[PDB]
């Protein structure tokens, strides 16, 4: 077809990546037995189609992966670490009571979990409880992480995953009065949660399932404190001194009243604890995974910007119903901001008209006080963490020209012709590298004469202990500063 | 007092009185000769 | 709609009152027992035809 | 005038129609009940009700 020559060869193919894998994320959650993925093994996920048959339909990991794919559109290589339900687990069961023959027209809307699972029935003048429950069960989306069974007024929703992750269900009518779309006289649907907890798994096998695969972001989809502490230990092991480091961060959540959420915290500088009020409508792991994906699909190429503010820190895939009582009161809000916790609020507070997307403040980590005991904010916000990782990697790549080069320690005089160097020249070259990076990785160094030190191993160690060709470098940087509070104080006159 | 009804909702507001066609008791027609006793229906009344 | 002809596809907002929703006015006062409203709870009033009930 | 001074809104009839004779009231001095400041120093900053809306 005039392409015969053989000079140009077309390969028209809509499924072709050009920009490498990029920005590896890992989503940890429980799955059902319907999936076809081997539990306790990290796998790669490429789309949101095969997730149903691989991780089971309705599993918490399935919804986590769906929200990850909804948020981060493109630029991330998502991986999943599916784990199975613990042996002793009472699948949570909730009861919903409907009632009131019927009296008029209108629409009956229900909101369960996230807005994607909202249902809308058309109950009109004259009906019966049994038929209303049948219509509800028929209208519930199959992807809802709860199996629905009618009892002619007692809708029973059983949790598809056993464990404490099921005790966080909420249903809002979001239609009583609701300023429009008036309701047919039914009943005040009643939400009761007869069932309970029965502890979830506790794997503690991160050192084997992922050995050297450097992951950028770990999100967790369980509320167990011990599991989160194990994840913290792992990520801390990634930021060690012994072995080369696969730097990483983790995103977890903590739901409850102010007392239990301040108790859930510690000096974990490796995780971004997300606080959640007791009356949170959205399922927690959904918003946790959305936050994790956003922070991984918007920063991995730009490791300086904080996930924060109306424009950047907007979780568009999560939709909450409007409300005037905003969970955490401002006192609790500032109390949580102080004790290293991420807080989330609404983004429209529009009274009673429609759904609104949540929004995060203070993209920070849970790093209150330093290692000794002193308080300091060097690792308060997560961008300082990503920036420290990037700076370490850049300095490591810059220093590679010395490893392998001839070095003179005594007599300091590189003879003519040879390609050696001495510690003073290495210190000068390192000083200039640190200097011409001011503005992109460091700040306006204050006393650079002692912020950077290069010592030969013949003097760091005691006498007759040093080893030729070993050096020690001590650097004290300071990440750049940005905009923060402004505190206007306008004051009119007479 | 007027209330907006719905899509699919007149059966409720009204009662949709159904139609009816009963013509038992054969109608009176001058084309027929009647005997004493023959009963007919004229104008909805039996004679 | 599939039967449509062109490509510009208008999607009318479900209801009007858009240009409001930024001027909320809260009227406070007493009510009789005939009413069906829950006391001590702000609730909007759309029209005038349903304040008596 | 006494009421105008102490930040009180006054309403009066628009037309001069005579006894009986329906009319319609209107408002003079759309002002707030703000006449002194903090630290007891008189002002007029928030007297006009529009000054408050403009502050917001």
XYZ file of C-alpha atoms in Angstrom:
650
model
C 0.000 0.000 0.000
C 2.745 2.453 -1.035
C 4.492 1.266 2.157
C 6.013 -1.706 0.335
C 9.557 -0.331 -0.060
C 10.572 -1.175 3.483
C 11.987 2.166 4.514
C 9.303 2.985 7.102
C 7.573 0.437 9.302
C 4.273 1.379 11.005
C 3.189 -0.165 14.299
C -0.197 1.446 14.969
C -0.948 0.327 18.521
C -3.038 2.252 21.085
C -1.444 0.381 24.018
C 2.140 1.645 24.144
C 3.917 3.331 27.032
C 6.640 5.870 26.302
C 7.667 7.299 29.687
C 8.894 4.258 31.622
C 7.111 2.659 34.543
C 7.445 5.622 36.892
C 6.448 6.346 40.473
C 5.916 2.869 41.885
C 3.068 2.651 44.412
C 1.998 -0.319 46.550
C -1.552 -0.855 47.822
C -1.948 -3.222 50.774
C -5.335 -4.678 51.600
C -7.501 -7.708 52.199
C -9.229 -9.625 49.425
C -11.923 -12.274 49.115
C -11.606 -15.867 47.939
C -13.143 -15.048 44.543
C -9.883 -13.524 43.329
C -7.264 -15.380 41.325
C -4.145 -13.721 42.764
C -1.831 -15.642 45.059
C -2.042 -14.068 48.535
C 1.104 -12.696 50.173
C 2.853 -11.830 46.909
C 3.372 -8.413 45.341
C 1.961 -8.219 41.810
C 1.592 -5.566 39.128
C -1.747 -4.000 38.181
C -2.240 -2.411 34.766
C -5.938 -1.502 34.525
C -9.196 -1.399 36.475
C -10.819 -4.206 34.464
C -9.030 -7.367 35.611
C -9.048 -6.250 39.258
C -12.474 -7.815 39.841
C -11.431 -11.370 38.998
C -7.952 -10.982 40.502
C -8.813 -9.545 43.928
C -12.447 -10.607 44.266
C -15.495 -8.447 43.619
C -16.248 -6.230 46.609
C -12.986 -6.673 48.507
C -11.546 -3.655 50.290
C -8.435 -3.994 48.157
C -10.641 -3.864 45.061
C -12.152 -0.526 46.064
C -8.729 0.749 47.122
C -7.332 -0.114 43.690
C -10.360 1.437 42.000
C -9.860 4.718 43.853
C -6.130 4.645 43.128
C -6.895 4.295 39.419
C -9.609 6.967 39.590
C -7.265 9.489 41.147
C -3.817 9.017 39.700
C -4.705 8.943 36.058
C -1.376 8.243 34.513
C 2.233 8.282 35.603
C 2.302 5.638 38.319
C 3.116 1.926 38.245
C 0.654 0.486 40.738
C 1.334 -2.756 42.597
C -0.930 -4.667 44.948
C -0.059 -6.757 47.979
C -3.270 -8.751 48.522
C -3.724 -10.569 51.823
C -6.543 -12.881 52.847
C -8.938 -12.820 55.778
C -7.760 -14.128 59.126
C -9.248 -17.408 60.331
C -11.292 -16.089 63.268
C -13.286 -13.290 61.667
C -16.959 -12.405 62.172
C -18.022 -10.784 58.907
C -19.694 -7.577 60.049
C -23.474 -7.408 59.640
C -25.624 -4.269 59.685
C -29.404 -3.949 59.820
C -31.424 -1.249 58.085
C -35.120 -0.930 58.911
C -37.524 0.707 56.477
C -41.247 1.343 57.015
C -44.358 3.427 56.369
C -46.746 2.073 53.708
C -46.623 5.147 51.434
C -48.484 8.396 50.958
C -47.144 10.415 48.083
C -44.604 10.721 45.270
C -40.918 11.663 45.182
C -37.526 9.990 45.129
C -35.880 8.014 47.930
C -32.090 8.345 47.769
C -29.620 6.457 49.944
C -25.900 7.046 50.440
C -23.797 4.091 51.614
C -20.031 4.371 51.929
C -18.879 6.492 49.004
C -21.124 8.313 46.540
C -20.363 5.771 43.816
C -22.594 3.343 45.736
C -25.532 5.746 46.092
C -28.949 4.373 45.165
C -32.113 6.153 44.055
C -35.518 4.487 44.083
C -38.730 6.013 42.766
C -41.227 5.204 45.535
C -44.538 6.792 44.521
C -47.972 7.251 46.099
C -48.849 3.860 47.545
C -46.310 1.072 48.145
C -45.220 -1.402 50.823
C -42.116 -2.016 52.928
C -41.396 -5.395 51.316
C -41.415 -3.912 47.814
C -39.282 -0.963 48.926
C -36.674 -3.351 50.327
C -36.777 -5.402 47.132
C -36.226 -2.264 45.051
C -33.350 -1.221 47.316
C -31.643 -4.612 47.079
C -32.115 -4.532 43.310
C -30.660 -1.013 43.125
C -27.540 -1.646 45.239
C -24.479 -1.728 43.014
C -22.800 -5.162 42.931
C -19.416 -3.572 43.647
C -20.631 -2.482 47.088
C -18.458 -4.195 49.724
C -21.541 -5.635 51.437
C -23.952 -8.429 50.530
C -27.577 -7.307 50.866
C -30.459 -9.603 51.850
C -34.026 -8.390 52.323
C -36.295 -9.425 55.205
C -39.344 -7.452 53.980
C -38.284 -4.520 56.088
C -34.947 -5.604 57.541
C -32.223 -5.089 54.958
C -29.218 -7.083 56.171
C -25.814 -5.967 54.871
C -23.051 -8.464 55.638
C -19.395 -7.512 55.255
C -17.532 -9.265 52.456
C -14.270 -9.057 54.455
C -14.011 -10.275 58.033
C -12.161 -8.064 60.483
C -12.231 -4.663 62.154
C -12.310 -2.975 58.731
C -16.044 -3.665 58.559
C -17.024 -1.671 61.641
C -16.837 1.614 59.695
C -20.073 1.580 57.704
C -22.458 4.520 57.549
C -25.701 5.211 55.694
C -27.182 8.691 55.342
C -30.637 9.406 53.975
C -29.475 12.806 52.585
C -33.062 13.403 51.492
C -35.187 14.161 54.588
C -36.542 17.509 53.476
C -33.220 18.156 51.706
C -34.488 21.372 50.152
C -35.568 19.594 46.946
C -36.722 16.254 45.562
C -39.239 15.663 48.304
C -39.661 12.250 49.857
C -42.646 9.902 49.885
C -43.661 9.325 53.493
C -41.742 6.201 54.453
C -39.865 5.943 57.736
C -36.678 7.194 59.370
C -34.514 4.312 58.153
C -32.689 2.878 61.166
C -29.018 1.850 61.231
C -27.959 -0.483 64.013
C -24.869 -2.665 63.378
C -25.689 -5.774 65.423
C -22.330 -7.485 64.737
C -18.737 -6.808 65.638
C -14.946 -7.149 65.402
C -13.037 -10.467 65.596
C -9.446 -9.365 64.913
C -8.071 -9.056 61.372
C -4.792 -10.532 60.060
C -1.301 -9.558 61.207
C 1.154 -10.559 58.469
C 4.561 -9.212 59.584
C 6.344 -10.548 56.493
C 7.451 -7.413 54.649
C 11.122 -8.392 54.747
C 10.389 -11.349 52.433
C 7.578 -10.376 50.054
C 9.515 -7.235 49.076
C 13.285 -7.542 49.526
C 14.901 -4.834 47.403
C 12.007 -3.534 45.279
C 12.303 0.179 46.037
C 8.719 1.416 46.390
C 7.819 5.090 46.539
C 4.500 5.008 48.426
C 2.862 2.348 50.607
C -0.836 2.753 51.372
C -2.543 0.606 53.989
C -6.196 -0.407 53.984
C -6.659 -1.656 57.539
C -7.215 -0.032 60.915
C -5.170 -2.480 62.993
C -2.581 -0.613 65.037
C -0.138 -3.535 65.110
C -0.244 -3.866 61.325
C 0.527 -0.168 60.943
C 3.352 -0.502 63.462
C 4.805 -3.351 61.397
C 4.609 -1.213 58.261
C 6.338 1.580 60.181
C 9.125 -0.779 61.221
C 9.575 -1.854 57.601
C 9.770 1.674 56.186
C 12.158 2.609 58.992
C 14.281 -0.356 57.939
C 14.260 1.162 54.462
C 15.745 4.363 55.928
C 18.689 2.700 57.648
C 22.437 3.192 57.635
C 23.512 -0.455 57.368
C 22.247 -1.318 53.897
C 21.605 0.849 50.838
C 18.245 2.518 51.260
C 15.028 2.106 49.284
C 13.488 5.338 50.531
C 9.732 5.247 51.024
C 6.687 6.685 52.750
C 3.473 5.206 54.089
C -0.082 6.485 54.347
C -2.402 5.177 57.072
C -5.573 6.320 58.822
C -6.949 6.456 62.352
C -10.661 6.842 63.046
C -12.223 7.627 66.401
C -12.702 10.319 68.992
C -9.952 12.761 69.919
C -8.618 10.628 72.758
C -8.104 7.435 70.798
C -6.662 9.231 67.774
C -4.105 11.120 69.854
C -3.324 7.758 71.438
C -2.859 6.120 68.022
C -0.008 8.500 67.295
C 3.669 8.184 68.104
C 6.944 9.609 66.799
C 6.549 7.673 63.537
C 8.335 9.966 61.095
C 7.865 7.345 58.358
C 4.060 7.488 58.105
C 1.434 10.130 57.419
C -1.263 9.376 59.970
C -4.630 10.627 58.699
C -7.124 11.487 61.417
C -10.805 10.832 60.896
C -13.806 11.942 62.963
C -16.189 9.456 64.513
C -19.081 10.464 62.225
C -17.163 10.224 58.950
C -19.578 9.239 56.155
C -17.078 7.895 53.621
C -15.438 4.524 54.152
C -11.982 5.324 55.546
C -9.720 3.218 53.352
C -11.191 4.866 50.255
C -10.071 8.369 51.200
C -6.792 6.977 52.536
C -5.992 5.329 49.202
C -7.091 8.420 47.274
C -4.742 10.603 49.310
C -1.941 8.090 48.827
C -2.385 7.932 45.066
C -2.629 11.695 44.668
C 0.559 12.195 46.656
C 2.229 9.676 44.337
C 0.990 10.963 40.987
C 1.864 14.567 41.466
C 5.038 14.658 43.333
C 7.181 11.879 42.116
C 8.428 14.082 39.267
C 8.288 17.201 41.480
C 9.386 16.213 44.975
C 8.910 19.678 46.459
C 5.207 20.535 46.354
C 3.002 19.758 49.330
C -0.319 18.007 48.766
C -2.225 20.907 50.273
C -4.722 23.622 49.512
C -7.854 23.923 47.412
C -6.022 23.285 44.139
C -3.412 20.634 44.892
C -4.788 18.690 47.842
C -8.199 17.970 46.319
C -9.469 14.382 46.421
C -11.815 14.537 43.460
C -12.758 10.848 43.477
C -14.142 10.926 47.030
C -17.608 12.461 47.363
C -19.228 13.210 50.725
C -22.720 14.546 51.416
C -22.913 18.086 52.567
C -23.311 18.915 56.241
C -23.053 21.930 58.527
C -21.534 20.141 61.557
C -18.014 19.430 60.249
C -16.818 16.493 62.322
C -13.713 17.824 64.048
C -14.470 21.108 65.737
C -11.791 23.730 65.192
C -10.367 23.096 68.655
C -9.896 19.439 67.803
C -8.562 20.533 64.413
C -5.724 22.629 65.800
C -5.079 20.035 68.509
C -4.568 17.435 65.775
C -2.486 19.757 63.588
C -0.185 20.194 66.579
C 0.331 16.470 67.239
C 1.432 15.599 63.698
C -1.842 14.438 62.137
C -3.300 15.076 58.698
C -6.758 16.649 58.909
C -9.391 16.751 56.188
C -12.387 18.991 55.688
C -15.001 19.797 53.078
C -14.323 22.062 50.130
C -17.704 23.745 49.603
C -19.805 23.585 52.853
C -22.852 24.430 50.733
C -25.586 23.777 53.306
C -27.902 21.164 51.762
C -27.647 20.912 47.995
C -25.371 18.091 46.816
C -22.165 16.089 47.259
C -18.837 17.785 47.965
C -15.287 16.514 47.644
C -13.117 16.387 50.773
C -9.817 18.227 51.006
C -6.700 17.865 53.142
C -4.817 20.404 55.195
C -1.221 20.230 56.386
C 0.400 17.454 54.355
C 2.663 16.576 57.274
C 4.139 13.494 58.936
C 3.997 12.275 62.527
C 7.443 13.582 63.510
C 7.014 15.631 66.674
C 10.339 15.446 68.496
C 13.855 14.584 67.392
C 15.687 11.340 68.110
C 17.267 12.480 71.367
C 14.154 14.064 72.815
C 14.148 17.603 71.486
C 11.240 19.037 69.483
C 12.071 20.115 65.944
C 10.293 20.329 62.605
C 13.000 19.117 60.223
C 10.854 16.133 59.197
C 7.450 17.651 59.917
C 6.056 17.989 56.396
C 6.412 15.144 53.918
C 8.024 17.263 51.214
C 11.050 17.639 53.486
C 11.259 13.849 53.530
C 11.021 13.438 49.755
C 13.498 16.305 49.364
C 16.005 14.694 51.726
C 15.761 11.465 49.746
C 16.291 13.269 46.440
C 19.234 15.252 47.821
C 20.901 12.126 49.157
C 20.544 10.376 45.812
C 21.869 13.397 43.909
C 24.907 13.746 46.171
C 25.566 10.021 45.833
C 25.543 10.301 42.044
C 27.796 13.363 42.152
C 30.401 11.723 44.394
C 30.877 8.819 41.971
C 33.790 10.494 40.182
C 36.002 10.009 43.243
C 35.374 6.298 43.819
C 38.158 4.840 41.687
C 40.417 7.913 41.515
C 43.962 8.190 42.852
C 44.052 10.160 46.106
C 46.982 11.757 47.930
C 46.728 12.140 51.700
C 50.314 12.731 52.773
C 52.581 15.167 50.887
C 49.497 16.575 49.126
C 51.455 17.342 45.917
C 49.902 15.699 42.877
C 52.930 15.149 40.663
C 52.868 16.481 37.129
C 50.824 14.483 34.659
C 49.060 12.061 36.999
C 45.321 12.301 37.609
C 45.213 12.257 41.401
C 43.608 14.593 43.929
C 43.889 15.513 47.601
C 41.295 16.073 50.371
C 41.379 19.867 50.068
C 40.545 19.724 46.365
C 37.751 17.216 46.975
C 36.371 19.502 49.675
C 36.467 22.479 47.330
C 34.703 20.575 44.564
C 32.031 19.316 46.966
C 31.568 22.837 48.322
C 30.980 24.166 44.835
C 28.488 21.391 44.064
C 26.572 22.179 47.236
C 26.775 25.881 46.413
C 25.504 25.929 42.840
C 22.492 23.879 43.966
C 21.275 26.626 46.303
C 17.744 27.419 45.165
C 16.669 23.961 44.008
C 17.805 21.568 46.747
C 19.370 23.622 49.553
C 18.793 27.024 51.070
C 20.881 30.151 51.553
C 23.694 28.416 53.512
C 24.705 30.442 56.552
C 28.194 29.332 57.611
C 29.249 26.996 54.780
C 32.772 27.124 56.201
C 31.640 24.469 58.699
C 28.421 23.105 57.199
C 30.509 20.782 54.988
C 33.413 18.761 56.375
C 35.644 16.201 54.654
C 37.905 14.151 56.915
C 40.344 11.441 55.937
C 39.961 8.119 57.693
C 43.481 8.393 59.110
C 42.221 10.999 61.591
C 38.567 10.106 62.228
C 39.663 6.729 63.577
C 42.306 6.242 66.289
C 45.990 5.829 65.549
C 47.047 2.841 63.418
C 43.413 2.106 62.549
C 42.644 4.048 59.360
C 42.306 2.452 55.946
C 43.705 4.110 52.796
C 40.999 5.498 50.546
C 38.208 5.916 53.119
C 36.681 9.348 53.711
C 34.023 10.803 56.000
C 31.703 13.594 54.870
C 29.467 15.629 57.181
C 26.941 17.961 55.558
C 24.290 20.170 57.184
C 21.827 21.356 54.584
C 18.562 23.261 54.899
C 15.661 22.625 52.568
C 14.242 25.715 50.885
C 11.511 27.727 52.549
C 8.082 28.333 51.046
C 4.886 30.271 51.620
C 2.835 29.693 54.759
C 0.373 31.649 56.907
C 0.004 35.366 56.164
C -2.034 36.674 59.131
C -3.685 39.776 57.734
C -4.712 42.319 60.382
C -6.795 44.873 58.517
C -8.011 47.680 60.749
C -10.195 50.491 59.376
C -10.077 54.029 60.712
C -12.779 56.672 61.625
C -53.593 21.793 47.870
C -52.485 20.870 44.362
C -49.533 18.502 44.717
C -47.005 17.669 41.972
C -47.608 14.057 41.193
C -44.678 12.070 39.733
C -43.594 10.162 36.687
C -45.771 7.088 36.846
C -48.387 8.107 39.336
C -51.900 8.834 38.227
C -53.301 5.436 39.285
C -52.814 6.904 42.774
C -54.261 10.406 42.471
C -57.310 9.278 40.514
C -58.963 5.861 40.657
C -59.266 5.472 36.833
C -62.916 4.293 36.715
C -62.932 1.507 34.153
C -65.312 1.165 31.244
C -68.249 -1.200 31.009
C -70.433 -2.614 28.221
C -73.298 -4.830 29.401
C -76.094 -5.435 26.906
C -77.853 -8.468 28.436
C -81.674 -8.288 28.344
C -81.785 -7.743 24.568
C -82.390 -4.161 23.494
C -85.775 -3.099 22.183
C -85.874 -2.925 18.400
C -88.935 -2.263 16.279
C -87.794 -4.921 13.787
C -89.027 -7.623 16.186
C -92.504 -8.678 17.247
C -92.968 -9.233 20.962
C -95.427 -11.347 22.932
C -97.033 -10.655 26.288
C -94.227 -11.209 28.784
C -91.250 -10.549 26.511
C -88.854 -8.344 28.465
C -86.579 -5.815 26.769
C -84.078 -3.166 27.824
C -84.724 0.379 26.631
C -82.732 3.361 27.839
C -81.144 1.156 30.473
C -84.511 0.224 32.002
C -86.183 -3.170 31.744
C -89.734 -3.173 30.411
C -30.148 10.852 23.263
C -29.196 8.615 20.359
C -31.761 10.053 17.937
C -30.038 13.454 18.014
C -28.357 14.908 14.934
C -25.449 17.237 15.730
C -22.672 16.934 18.277
C -23.050 19.867 20.673
C -24.941 18.161 23.505
C -26.604 20.370 26.099
C -27.108 18.956 29.600
C -29.547 21.164 31.499
C -28.854 21.487 35.209
C -31.495 19.507 37.163
C -33.063 22.591 38.721
C -32.908 26.374 38.861
C -31.987 28.707 41.805
C -28.315 28.578 40.895
C -27.692 32.308 41.131
C -28.832 32.180 44.733
C -27.291 29.753 47.177
C -24.947 32.564 48.212
C -27.385 34.828 50.035
C -28.811 32.545 52.637
C -31.167 34.256 55.058
C -32.113 32.617 58.335
C -35.481 33.563 59.656
C -36.049 32.646 63.297
C -39.352 32.592 65.134
C -41.909 30.464 66.889
C -44.255 27.945 65.306
C -47.532 26.357 66.315
C -48.106 22.664 66.975
C -49.954 22.132 63.689
C -46.636 22.267 61.865
C -44.756 19.167 60.763
C -41.270 20.659 61.126
C -38.784 19.425 63.693
C -38.141 22.282 66.150
C -34.669 23.601 66.915
C -33.195 22.668 63.545
C -32.442 24.915 60.583
C -34.322 23.800 57.477
C -34.633 25.629 54.184
C -37.926 26.800 52.694
C -38.149 26.666 48.909
C -41.592 28.031 48.095
C -44.519 29.767 49.764
C -47.086 27.022 49.129
C -45.856 24.830 51.993
C -45.180 27.035 55.012
C -48.643 26.601 56.511
C -48.326 22.811 56.718
C -33.106 62.629 65.852
C -32.530 61.166 69.320
C -32.903 57.710 67.787
C -30.690 58.530 64.795
C -27.943 59.498 67.227
C -27.892 56.275 69.266
C -27.577 53.951 66.266
C -31.273 53.105 65.902
C -32.970 52.473 62.576
C -36.144 54.512 62.061
C -38.930 53.813 59.575
C -41.491 56.339 58.424
C -44.241 56.677 55.833
C -43.260 57.571 52.290
C -46.256 59.566 51.063
C -48.125 62.327 52.889
C -51.620 60.916 52.469
C -53.644 62.164 55.432
C -55.558 60.218 58.052
C -56.769 56.823 56.952
C -55.372 56.587 53.465
C -53.052 53.553 53.217
C -49.306 54.175 52.794
C -46.051 52.214 52.953
C -43.140 52.655 55.367
C -39.544 53.104 54.292
C -36.274 53.207 56.113
C -34.006 55.960 57.021
C -30.368 55.605 58.191
C -29.599 51.980 57.395
C -27.120 51.902 60.266
C -25.949 49.373 62.823
C -26.159 49.783 66.584
C -22.447 50.622 66.812
C -21.514 53.983 68.281
C -18.437 53.401 70.458
C -15.218 51.570 69.857
C -12.906 49.399 71.734
C -11.305 51.143 74.651
C -14.294 53.461 74.752
C -13.313 55.871 72.003
C -16.186 57.012 69.757
C -16.086 56.165 66.064
C -18.205 55.856 62.940
C -16.432 52.955 61.241
C -19.200 50.357 61.556
C -22.153 52.739 61.818
C -23.257 52.323 58.211
C -24.558 48.821 57.601
C -22.757 48.846 54.241
C -19.401 49.376 55.945
C -19.838 45.978 57.582
C -20.680 44.197 54.327
C -17.702 45.903 52.709
C -15.440 44.782 55.554
C -16.530 41.203 54.903
